[PDB]
Design a protein around this ligand. Structure first.
Ligand SMILES: CCCCCCCCCCCCCCCCCC(=O)OC[C@H](COP(=O)(O)OCCN)OC(=O)CCCCCCCCCCCCCCCCC
Ligand SMILES: CCCCCCCCCCCCCCCCCC(=O)OC[C@H](COP(=O)(O)OCCN)OC(=O)CCCCCCCCCCCCCCCCC
Ligand SMILES: CCCCCCCCCCCCCCCCCC(=O)OC[C@H](COP(=O)(O)OCCN)OC(=O)CCCCCCCCCCCCCCCCC
Ligand SMILES: CCCCCCCCCCCCCCCCCCCC
Ligand SMILES: CCCCCCCCCCCCCCCCCCCC
Ligand SMILES: CCCCCCCCCCCCCCCCCCCC
Lengths: 323, 113, 162, 470, 100, 297
């Protein structure tokens, strides 16, 4: 069984498994870091008693959520109820599955890349839709309808925001997109693409200020209200893993990915990614929540023509520079 | 080649292990923990007809997503298409923005009455 | 490559059979989404990478989202649907099934009587599809934009609430 | 193949109608004005009709790997544009009584006219498919424009579901055809076959599914059951447009497809279309015997006239004047159907019994009886010239069963057409310039029918000038 | 190495299954679902045909097919919405007022 | 002639009228609260909403929405039933009485001195502000004119508790808009106020420190120091609150033009305070009908 081909196969599989486990661990530890960084932002400490510095708080929450009674309503449809958190986790995990963290460290060097990310987001909206329908609660039903129409209103231009970087790199591949940022990062030319992708990625991740269950707690119309135990935990863990995925895609698409002058490439990638996770915390802790009609009006009247104009101007620059 | 099939194996292992991870998470959550009964436990939590604007928003998402797929196909082949394809895509985006402006002005994209 | 194609084709066939014989609209739409994922796997097996990407982005990500949206707003509790089960009643379904059966045998006779050198599975990237789309197929692009505009206007005019 | 400025000047009606669509849409976005948007739509359609002159002076050439422009394309573009102009003219007094938004009607008419022009210019399977869909979907909107009404909503649902089924059938047919041949151009459909092996089963099955879709679109038996319901339930200007423009554009693209393809001269396809044409003529004439509704009667009339059209279709490869017969018949049928459905529209306008029509509306009664004599193929009318052309083409190719079917269906059509035309003059128990414009449109249609039935030579010369490429 | 005939057979099977679902179901939603199945099967057949010949024309025809499918689904669901709004049922046999 | 004369404090299945003199006040007079299955079902049936009984006067689209009665906010627990056309509120009627404590019946049940803790919990964000009119009215009954030091002490504590209540209100409004950090900082400022109030009275939210004729104790030695720390602490924090959340355009879009009324609607409905004075009507009790030596400030 000793052969270089089988050795390369096993090392590549081990690299993929290591990447997957590190992403899941980072998402959970980033739920904990959400709590700690909110404490830092709000002149307090947050959880710092369970273990050293609160580092064992995640393990305590994990034990609680595993040994909490997992319950499915009698009026609910079992398969859809059991399927919605699976979608909310798996869709954004497999969306991460194309992100290159280092030269030679990638799981799938696909020819579609961010197209595959668009496939996973379009599948990810089904988690909210299925959580709303499955619970057999009308309040959760209209909450899921509102959140799903919001995510459609921002998914309508998520890909078009990415298309400026796609046009500049000339390919759908992620590694070619990173390699096109070897001289200048894409945040400078595709700045409008950068802000529109930030807004759309925050909105499709159901993060503040686009979170629906935290928007209206008086109505009790959230689509999470009938989930408990490890299903609600899967909803939360998939939300934070989606935050990690969106931040890493933002780093690879607008901030050069792993490219840097002095540090090793994974150190630069982790630093830029963690900076964008901290910016997620700061966005949650800083901005007020707009109204529903205001949010979808900002999605439709403003951001989509901005993405179209950005793509048109990017194309004009590209063909102008190609003599 | 060996590298491409190793990449395919790594991707397959990634998808399989992720799906098995969330499946085992469900198995552990359902199997572990005691269960107890209450009278109003099975009743849905309700703190103790939908409009057609949802359909309109989803419909607009579908239509503009198909035109987005057209621009997806354009964007990866911008340099080989040249200035002629730029003119065609400018006409395409002009029609797209005219339809968007028409939707805006007649209140189709206005959620509030 | 061929094994994935045959498995995905079998999954798509079984899922479509489950859609056309179901009473729950949401279950039927979920099985339809599963069949669309399987047909996307078929597309990826044949080297049409862009076609599978569009199947999950657009067909399984926009159109079925619209169908699921509509089924949500209808609140279909199976009123005179689950209480009838008339499609499962045999003398209703024997006729059209044998109609589609003889049509399928005729189409299979047509298919088996053609030259087949096999599909080599060479991947066709989205760059070549985009070059062709804005090259020899430009009027198709602009008039398809006009077709989407026509559908937009038609379904806005029909599907208002007032 | 790239696009040249000469290819742009060949694109003139398509570009003009598309620019009209954009301009009318932006004007609706500015301010909802029914008169100004209708005027803009009529101005754009008339501009395309005028620019057909520049297209003719441009010459006949190939603009795309998809489109081909020749005199055949000009003739069918002119027919579609005239039908759309008459549809707008009939639609304005009907839309004067519509409580909801009226401005989307002309947008849908313009997009359907765009699809008709594309079908006229189509030399490809992609252009054929896109033109069929670009005609169909605005007709989905227009048939159910008065969606509050029971009949209009029912007709819209029926037309939408059945045309989606026909679109899937047609698309699977060209999928099989492309799987066999490898090129989607019209000239290469069977070019890779020789030595008498043209009847390949996969190509024949793909063309059969295409025949299923197109025979839905042409109201051909046995895909004809939608025609009386969709004709009756739709608004009368929509019935006018669906009777004239859609049928003419789809039959023109079927003409071009069966001329250019090597598989078009297959024996099995010819026998299948002969059966379809025979059954279409006989069934459409027989099912209109006991119709008291004018719209269903004219739908069955459309089925019969399309059967005569298919009889003229079958002798394409043998006879030499089959295209000339189709053009003359289609000009006459456009004029007759425009007049008949226009008088029906003017009696159905504004949006809120043909017996005894002469005693309050004598001019419209005279126009109606002229068109019901025209659809019967009575001499001194252009429908007679079309029927004479169809019979001559059938006699040349020895299509004797089709000739007998035409004669028998002509007798049955004579029965019911004369029944209506003489029920006009029995005894039974407006005030705007657009209604007068519709009356002028139907009056010039009747005068054209009478003049070209007495003197058909200018129309024959015009149609003979519209010769497609060899 | 995948035969073209097997892909065409799969597309034909999905096409006739969609037609069966279109015919045997009274509910307008299930007929729209069946129509979507038929047009997606035709798009699959066109993709297989384009992939055998090594041409992008199959994927271009697939793109046109899904554009038609999206717009037709939009129009059909709008008609279904109005039918449910004014009729309170989805029985397609109930709308049969026009006959003969 | 009342449009609907139903009970507003007690449930509809209640026998007798509580504020009559022959009605027993205390719960120990009644049987102790037993919750059986039939009792739980019967009381859950009574809390269900029926469109016809509340005078809704109902179109095949008017859906009904339930807000409470459990309420995720600091200001009590209550219900609102909403008639909706799409998202538009066509009609609504508030359901109150879920927080009924019988404080007036306790006024008939406690003595003049012992009722002051119950006067504290009338508006539990007000404290000494709630104690002030009761002790003023009792001093009117007793013929007591309090000295000037008493008036200044009561004004000082009333303004301290007014700043506490307004801080909680602004923080809760900003949190309900969607910014969750000023509630943390405003409760820190509330802790500073609470330090001073604990030093003076010995309690945080319900001091019960005002008395008939004065206050319970003298001011402790060092009250001026804590008041100095609060007066130095407050204005920079308030300016940070404005700049961070109150001048945010998202908050302005959520707030400006929302539920607006004029002087006539404020006058006809008895609205007072900031809602009345935002209509331009200069009517404050401290300046129109001065009390407790508020004319010297
Ligand atoms: C509850 C479970 C629901 C279903 C979950 C999924 C079921 C299947 C799980 C097992 C999958 C095993 C692995 C499949 C093959 C992976 C590798 C692959 O697709 O390789 C082909 C191709 C290679 O690309 P490349 O190398 O760049 O091409 C040049 C030529 N070699 O690469 C590609 O073509 C890449 C594009 C295809 C990738 C597909 C990934 C999965 C898609 C489905 C996601 C489902 C999400 C959850 C459910 C949503 C709701 C139903
Ligand atoms: C195991 C038994 C069945 C168990 C239950 C069902 C599980 C899911 C089965 C379907 C999905 C996995 C199929 C197996 C794929 C394994 C990888 C493979 O075959 O790769 C071959 C090929 C790689 O690309 P290529 O370049 O063509 O390779 C030539 C060599 N250089 O690959 C390709 O070209 C494309 C590979 C397929 C496309 C990507 C994956 C699509 C996934 C679709 C899921 C659909 C929903 C499934 C729901 C299941 C539950 C009901
Ligand atoms: C990894 C990716 C993510 C990384 C994290 C960092 C990026 C996060 C981006 C978050 C974006 C949130 C966008 C929220 C938009 C809200 C728009 C809206 O609806 O505003 C409504 C408001 C008033 O609306 P109006 O119609 O005027 O109402 C009048 C009624 N009296 O209108 C207004 O107030 C007008 C202004 C609207 C907002 C404009 C856009 C602001 C975006 C947030 C600031 C971002 C700054 C850069 C941060 C660093 C990024 C690295
Ligand atoms: C938020 C960041 C998530 C990262 C997930 C993937 C982690 C992969 C770790 C790879 C480590 C080795 C990288 C190559 C060697 C160069 C760097 C060496 C020092 C770390
Ligand atoms: C209330 C209206 C119900 C309409 C149901 C229609 C069902 C049609 C069933 C057709 C069955 C055909 C069986 C085979 C016929 C012979 C083979 C095909 C023709 C040669
Ligand atoms: C209903 C119409 C019937 C028409 C019958 C026409 C019969 C024509 C027979 C021609 C035979 C030709 C033989 C060579």
């Amino acid at each position: 069984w000793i052969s270089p081909e089988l050795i390369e196969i096993l090392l590549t599989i081990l690299k993929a498994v290591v990447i997957l486990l590190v992403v899941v661990t980072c998402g959970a530890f980033m739920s904990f870091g959400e709590r700690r960084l909110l404490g830092l932002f709000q002149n307090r400490y947050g959880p710092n008693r369970v273990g050293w510095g609160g580092s064992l708080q995640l393990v305590a929450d994990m034990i609680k959520m595993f040994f909490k009674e997992d319950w499915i309503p009698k009026f609910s449809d079992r398969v859809i109820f059991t399927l919605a958190p699976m979608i909310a986790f798996t869709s954004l995990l497999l969306a991460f599955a194309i992100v290159p963290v280092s030269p030679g460290w990638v799981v799938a060097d696909l020819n579609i890349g961010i197209l595959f990310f668009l496939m996973m987001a379009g599948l990810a909206v089904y988690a909210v839709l299925f959580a709303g329908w499955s619970s057999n609660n009308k309040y959760s039903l209209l909450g899921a309808m509102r959140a799903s129409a919001q995510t459609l209103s921002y998914e309508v231009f998520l890909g078009l925001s990415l298309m400026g970087v796609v046009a500049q790199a000339g390919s759908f591949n992620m590694t070619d997109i990173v390699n096109s940022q070897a001289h200048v990062w894409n945040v400078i030319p595709q700045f409008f693409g950068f802000i529109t992708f930030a807004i759309a990625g925050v909105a499709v991740c159901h993060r503040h200020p686009f979170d629906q269950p935290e928007a209206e707690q008086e109505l009790a119309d959230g689509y999470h209200i009938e989930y408990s135990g490890m299903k609600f935990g899967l909803f939360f863990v998939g939300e934070y893993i989606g935050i990690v995925t969106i931040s890493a895609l933002m780093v690879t698409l607008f901030f050069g990915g792993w490219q840097g002058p002095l540090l090793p490439p994974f150190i630069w990638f982790a630093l830029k990614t963690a900076f964008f996770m901290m910016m997620f915390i700061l966005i949650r802790a800083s901005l007020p929540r707009p109204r529903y009609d205001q949010v979808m009006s900002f999605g439709w009247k403003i951001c989509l023509p901005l993405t179209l104009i950005n793509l048109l101007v990017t194309a004009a620059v590209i063909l102008w520079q190609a003599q | 080649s060996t590298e491409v099939i190793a990449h395919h194996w790594a991707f397959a292992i990634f998808l399989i292990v992720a799906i098995g991870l969330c499946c085992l998470m469900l198995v552990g959550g359902w199997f572990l923990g005691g269960r107890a009964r209450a009278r109003s436990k099975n009743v849905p939590f309700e703190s103790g007809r939908l409009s057609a604007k949802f359909y309109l928003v989803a419909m607009f998402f579908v239509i503009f997503d198909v035109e987005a797929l057209y621009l997806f196909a354009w964007s990866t082949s911008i340099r080989e298409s040249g200035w002629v394809g730029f003119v065609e895509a400018a006409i395409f985006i002009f029609v797209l923005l005219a339809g968007l402006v028409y939707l805006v002005r007649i209140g189709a994209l206005d959620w509030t009455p | 490559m061929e094994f994935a194609f045959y498995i995905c084709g079998l999954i798509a066939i079984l899922a479509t059979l489950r859609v056309i014989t179901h009473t729950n609209p949401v279950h039927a739409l979920l099985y339809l989404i599963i069949s669309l994922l399987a047909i996307s796997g078929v597309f990826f097996s044949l080297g049409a990478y862009f076609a599978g990407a569009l199947e999950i982005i657009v067909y399984a990500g926009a159109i079925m989202v619209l169908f699921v949206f509509v089924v949500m707003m209808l609140n279909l509790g199976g009123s005179e649907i689950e209480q009838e089960r008339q499609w499962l009643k045999p003398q209703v379904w024997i006729g059209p099934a044998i109609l589609s059966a003889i049509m399928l045998v005729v189409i299979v006779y047509a298919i088996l009587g053609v030259n087949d050198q096999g599909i080599d599975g060479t991947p066709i990237s989205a760059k070549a599809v985009g070059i062709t789309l804005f090259g020899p197929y430009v009027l198709a692009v602009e008039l398809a934009s006009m077709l989407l505009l026509a559908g937009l206007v038609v379904a806005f005019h029909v599907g208002r609430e007032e | 193949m790239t696009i040249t400025p000469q290819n742009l000047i060949a694109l003139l009606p398509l570009l003009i109608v598309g620019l009209t669509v954009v301009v009318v849409m932006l004007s609706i976005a500015w301010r909802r004005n029914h008169f100004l948007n209708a005027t803009l739509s009529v101005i754009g359609l008339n501009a395309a009709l005028v620019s057909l002159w520049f297209v003719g002076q441009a010459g006949a050439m190939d603009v795309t790997p998809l489109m081909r422009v020749d005199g055949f394309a000009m003739l069918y573009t002119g027919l579609v544009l005239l039908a759309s102009l008459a549809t707008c003219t009939f639609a304005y007094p009907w839309l004067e009584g519509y409580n909801d938004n009226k401005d989307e009607f002309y947008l849908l008419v313009l997009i359907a006219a765009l699809g008709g022009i594309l079908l006229a210019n189509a030399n490809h399977l992609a252009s054929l498919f896109l033109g069929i869909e670009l005609i169909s979907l605005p007709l989905f909107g227009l048939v159910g424009y008065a969606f509050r009404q029971k009949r209009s909503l029912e007709a819209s649902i029926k037309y939408t579901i059945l045309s989606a089924a026909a679109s899937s059938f047609l698309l699977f047919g060209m999928a099989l055809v492309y799987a066999q041949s490898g090129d989607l151009s019209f000239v290469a459909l069977g070019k890779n076959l020789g030595d008498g092996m043209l009847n390949e089963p996969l190509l024949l099955a793909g063309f059969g599914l295409m025949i299923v879709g197109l025979g839905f679109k042409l109201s051909l038996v046995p895909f004809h059951l939608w025609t009386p319901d969709v004709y009756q339930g739709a608004p009368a200007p929509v019935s006018t447009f669906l009777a004239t423009a859609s049928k003419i554009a789809i039959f023109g693209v079927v003409m071009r497809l069966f001329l250019y393809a090597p598989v078009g001269d297959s024996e099995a396809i010819r026998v299948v279309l002969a059966i379809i044409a025979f059954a279409s003529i006989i069934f459409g004439n027989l099912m209109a015997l006991s119709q008291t509704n004018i719209k269903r009667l004219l739908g069955y009339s459309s089925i019969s006239h399309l059967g005569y059209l298919l009889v003229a279709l079958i002798a394409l490869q043998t006879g030499e004047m089959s295209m000339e017969a189709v053009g003359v018949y289609l000009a006459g049928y456009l004029f007759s159907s425009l007049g008949a459905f226009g008088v029906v529209s003017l009696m159905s306008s504004p949006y809120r019994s043909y017996r005894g029509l002469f005693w309050h509306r004598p001019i419209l009664a005279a126009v109606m009886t002229v068109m019901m004599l025209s659809l019967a193929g009575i001499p001194m009318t252009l429908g007679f010239i079309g029927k004479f052309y169809v019979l001559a083409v059938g006699v040349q190719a020895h299509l004797w069963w089709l000739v007998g079917a035409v004669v028998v269906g002509s007798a049955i059509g004579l029965y019911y057409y004369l029944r209506v035309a003489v029920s006009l003059y029995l005894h039974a128990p407006p005030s705007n310039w657009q209604y007068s414009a519709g009356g002028i449109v139907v009056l010039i249609s009747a005068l054209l029918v009478l003049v070209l039935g007495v003197w058909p030579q200018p129309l024959i010369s015009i149609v003979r000038l519209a010769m497609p490429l060899m | 190495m995948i035969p073209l005939q097997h892909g065409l057979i799969l597309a034909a099977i999905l096409f006739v299954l969609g037609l069966t679902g279109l015919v045997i179901r009274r509910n307008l939603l299930f007929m729209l679902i069946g129509l979507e199945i038929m047009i997606n099967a035709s798009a699959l057949a066109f993709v297989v045909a384009g992939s055998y010949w090594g041409q992008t024309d199959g994927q271009v025809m697939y793109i046109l097919a899904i554009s038609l499918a999206a717009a037709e689904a939009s129009i059909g669901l709008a008609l279904l919405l109005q039918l449910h709004r004014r009729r309170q049922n989805l029985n397609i046999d109930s709308v049969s007022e026009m006959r003969g | 002639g009342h449009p609907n004369l139903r009970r507003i404090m007690m449930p509809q299945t209640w026998k007798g009228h509580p504020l009559r003199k022959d009605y027993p006040a205390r719960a120990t007079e009644f049987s102790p609260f037993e919750l059986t299955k039939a009792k739980q079902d019967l009381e859950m049936e009574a809390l269900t909403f029926k469109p016809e009984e509340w005078g809704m006067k109902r179109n095949e689209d008017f859906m009904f929405l339930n807000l409470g009665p459990n309420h995720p906010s600091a200001h009590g627990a209550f219900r609102i039933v909403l008639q909706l056309d799409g998202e538009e509120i066509v009609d609504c009627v508030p359901d109150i009485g879920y927080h009924h404590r019988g404080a007036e019946k306790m006024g008939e049940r406690q003595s003049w001195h012992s009722y002051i803790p119950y006067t504290d919990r009338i508006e539990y964000l007000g404290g000494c502000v709630n104690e002030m009119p009761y002790v003023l009215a009792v001093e009117k009954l007793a013929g007591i004119t309090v000295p000037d030091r008493v008036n200044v002490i009561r004004v000082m504590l009333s303004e301290l508790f007014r700043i506490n209540s307004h801080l909680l209100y602004i923080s809760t409004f900003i949190q309900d808009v969607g910014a969750m950090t000023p509630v943390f900082f405003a409760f820190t400022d509330r802790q500073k106020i609470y330090d001073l109030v604990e030093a003076i009275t010995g309690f945080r939210m319900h001091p019960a420190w005002f008395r008939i004729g004065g206050v319970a104790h003298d001011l402790p030695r060092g009250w001026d120091r804590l008041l100095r720390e609060f007066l130095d602490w407050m204005p920079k924090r308030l300016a940070s609150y404005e700049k961070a959340a109150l001048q945010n355009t998202i908050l302005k879009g959520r707030s400006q033009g929302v539920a607006a009324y004029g002087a006539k609607e404020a006058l006809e409905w008895g609205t007072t305070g900031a809602g009345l004075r935002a209509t331009g009507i200069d009517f404050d009790v401290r300046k129109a009908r001065p009390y407790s030596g508020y004319e010297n400030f």
